[PDB]
């Protein structure tokens, strides 16, 4: 039933799109920080796809995770760990999600996806 | 420079595969436990594909990982968190790797890489 797809040119990969929606998790895998200002994450179910812009001056530091949860997950913000999309809730569960994280160019430099086959 | 890769059928994925060339990690992404009794991995560097097989009886509960040390890496084994390969020593450095997990069956149900590009 379940598939998975997941891709990354680089330090920072995308590490898990949650089942019953709530959160994206994002991490680097490098040893070298990672400054993600201006970056973007687009996450595609079906016909929308909602961009998350990262602040200006959001460094992901080596070997550590942010987790990007709705407004409706009922976890707050404790930057730079966690973090809250404004405006946007659950996006729900049984839709096949596939979500990009783009860089301030606008290169793809990572990618992950949940396909549901049956 | 490095790039990554990843797909999963099932419950078990591939997490990480370690650059320093010292351990195979993965996950139990679902909730589900899975038996994980006579699966095989086989790590594909160049042309060699050495494999490690699983216990009869091993169980990757809900969100929980195993990571296959090496031998030489210093670590003992505790399970069911960490594992030993027995006689397989580092992997190295700058080599392209890839780690395929296969079910008792003998299908695949994950897939790795790390490629390394100057």
Redesign the interface.
Same mark, same amino acid.
Do not use: D, L, N, Y
């Given at each position: 039933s379940? +598939?998975? +797809? %997941? +891709? %990354? #040119?680089?330090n920072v990969?995308i590490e898990?799109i949650d089942?019953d929606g709530k959160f994206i998790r994002l991490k680097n #895998?490098?040893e070298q920080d990672q400054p993600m200002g201006g970056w973007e994450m687009i996450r595609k179910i079906g016909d929308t796809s909602v961009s998350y812009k990262y602040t200006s001056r959001y460094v992901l530091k080596a070997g550590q995770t942010v987790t990007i949860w709705a407004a409706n997950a009922g976890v707050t913000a404790s930057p730079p760990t966690d973090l809250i999309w404004k405006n946007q809730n659950s996006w729900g569960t049984g839709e096949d999600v596939k979500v990009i994280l783009k860089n301030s160019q606008g290169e793809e430099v990572a990618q992950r996806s949940t396909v549901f086959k049956t």
């Open positions: 379940i +598939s998975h +797809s %997941a +891709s %990354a #040119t680089g990969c898990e089942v #895998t490098s």
